[PDB]
Structure 1
Amino acid sequence: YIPGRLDGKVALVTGSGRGIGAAVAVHLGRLGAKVVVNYANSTKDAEKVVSEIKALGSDAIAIKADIRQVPEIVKLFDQAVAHFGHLDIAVSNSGVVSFGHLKDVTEEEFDRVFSLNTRGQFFVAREAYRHLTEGGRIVLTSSNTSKDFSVPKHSLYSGSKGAVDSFVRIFSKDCGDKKITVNAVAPGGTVTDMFHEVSHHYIPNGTSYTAEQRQQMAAHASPLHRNGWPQDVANVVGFLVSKEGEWVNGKVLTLDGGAA
């Protein structure tokens, strides 16, 4: 046995075909876990994440499921178990970002965001509890903007992750009857497609800076003068879902390099 390792464990990561999810999947594979890789759209990217987990000497499978659909989350979890035999770790990572002044937010934009970020995560957790083995791990995904960072025109997304914060604290109470811990990672600005999507909204007059200048300014948010990377979030998920991480339970961990 090796401390911090996941030899003989089976894990599932939602939206692990790219971004943070991809780094989490690969890292769980590096730690010894067999991995179910979930995507909605990024097939080739998911097959590529599968390849890397195998390349490290583990096993992985790619399963297409749209996390907005609860019948699909159920089917995803059923198929995970039927393939690997059991499931120990579930990481809810899939999410979308949004910007808009309160006055312009539509019914459709609200639903687009909450169906995935909140409702989706809520039922990934449900299916995880239902399918997991005794002593398992569930990790959901929040945001530094949930509680720790206040950005104009960012109310919908912030709120969607605020629910997740309350969710995991109470989930830990219910999930304890199967000795399962429930936590959330709350990343700050982490360099992925999402970062490039909305970095201009996190900076005063963001439009008047290049993409690279915005990345450099984001790097100075942290007193460590660097950006957050998907590996940083992976590193923490790795510890949370290890035997050693058990006493962290029902907590939300903000991962912004000390920006807050």
Structure 2
Amino acid sequence: LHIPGRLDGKVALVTGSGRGIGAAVAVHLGLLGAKVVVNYANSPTHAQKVVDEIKQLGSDAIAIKADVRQVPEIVRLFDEAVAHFGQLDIAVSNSGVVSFGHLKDVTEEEFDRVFSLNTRGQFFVAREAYKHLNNGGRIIMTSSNTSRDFSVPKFSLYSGSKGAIDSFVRIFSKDCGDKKITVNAVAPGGTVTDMFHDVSQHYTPEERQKMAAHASPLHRNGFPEDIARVVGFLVSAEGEWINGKVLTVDGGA
């Protein structure tokens, strides 16, 4: 009885996996039988619950605090991961922040807060992933359906921050080929997390939420484990021949 997309005796790291989409990727890869490094930066207990979750279903994990806005903290994060589990097969760039505002009101402090994590951060996560990763490995980065599909106004700073991700992946896949490493991006849609709720107020968390379901031909919201399942396939052996691509997981939204 053939079991697909498994990751047994493979190590995976997932920036900002304490809560939200990243935490499901952390678990899924754990379920499909990867050992998992669960990076957080502000949510220490949240991360220890994800380490706990992955252990209960028969694989190992350690949480590692790191601000991935800080390239040396990223060097240490990858340096520490390989120190612990011995190697690293999978690196998922998940960590991100949202911003809202009309072009006229967007400040220098605000451009940077956003770009420092979502774009520079993810790029430098990807850098140390290539240096630290084994041959046949997997980088995965997170964009947004807004990058180019969705056209939310007063969403320019955020969308641009992920538009750069869209352009990194097709080229990274050329560069990363000489360690036989595939690079792909996932562009989630409206995944239900603390972030989705902060961007719906633009009332109740769930009342707002109940509108977005009436917009997917599948009449439900996207949830973190809907994106996780697409990253699990992509970091599997099976899905090696998807390379340099931005997958969009929105449900037809």
Which range, TM-score by smaller chain?
over 0.9
What does 1:159-178 align with in structure 2 at a 5 Å threshold? Answer: 159-178=160-179
Matched with 1:204 is none
TM-score by length of 2: 0.98
What does 1:46-195 align with in structure 2 at a 5 Å threshold? Answer: 46-195=47-196
1:38 Cα deviation from its structure 2 partner: 0.1
Q: CA separation in 2, counterparts of 1:144 and 1:186?
A: 5
Q: CA separation in 2, counterparts of 1:91 and 1:139?
A: 5
1:220 Cα deviation from its structure 2 partner: 1.5
Tell me which amino acid in the other structure corresponds to 1:244. Answer: E
Gap runs ≥5 in structure 1: 202-208
Q: Does 1:32 align with 2:26?
A: no
Q: Which runs of 4+ in 1 moved over 4 A?
A: none
Identity of aligned residues (%): 87
Q: CA separation in 1, counterparts of 2:242 and 2:205?
A: 36
Give the match's secondary structure for 1:61: strand
Q: CA separation in 2, counterparts of 1:11 and 1:235?
A: 15
Matched with 1:254 is 248
Q: CA separation in 2, counterparts of 1:177 and 1:24?
A: 26
Deviations 1:89-115 (A, max 9, x none): 000000000000000100000000000
1:216 Cα deviation from its structure 2 partner: 1.1
Deviations 1:98-147 (A, max 9, x none): 00000010000000000000000000000000000000000000000001
Q: Number of paired residues? A: 252
1:156 Cα deviation from its structure 2 partner: 0.2
1:20 Cα deviation from its structure 2 partner: 0.4
Give the match's secondary structure for 2:251: coil
1:2 Cα deviation from its structure 2 partner: 3.8
Q: CA separation in 1, counterparts of 2:153 and 2:211?
A: 18
Tell me which amino acid in the other structure corresponds to 2:138. Answer: R
Q: CA separation in 2, counterparts of 1:87 and 1:211?
A: 38
Q: CA separation in 1, counterparts of 2:66 and 2:187?
A: 24
RMSD value, Cα? 0.9
1:185 Cα deviation from its structure 2 partner: 0.3
TM-score by length of 1: 0.96
Tell me which amino acid in the other structure corresponds to 1:59. Answer: D
Tell me which amino acid in the other structure corresponds to 1:70. Answer: V
Matched with 2:45 is 44
Q: CA separation in 2, counterparts of 1:165 and 1:106?
A: 24
Aligned pair partner of 1:225 in 205, 219, 227: 219
Deviations 1:148-184 (A, max 9, x none): 0001100000000000000011000000000000000
Q: CA separation in 2, counterparts of 1:146 and 1:84?
A: 35
Gap runs ≥5 in structure 2: none
Matched with 2:228 is 234
Q: CA separation in 2, counterparts of 1:221 and 1:255?
A: 14
Give the match's secondary structure for 1:152: coil
Q: CA separation in 2, counterparts of 1:5 and 1:112?
A: 37
Tell me which amino acid in the other structure corresponds to 1:228. Answer: G
Deviations 1:42-94 (A, max 9, x none): 00000110001000010000000000000000000000001000000000000
Q: CA separation in 2, counterparts of 1:95 and 1:162?
A: 13
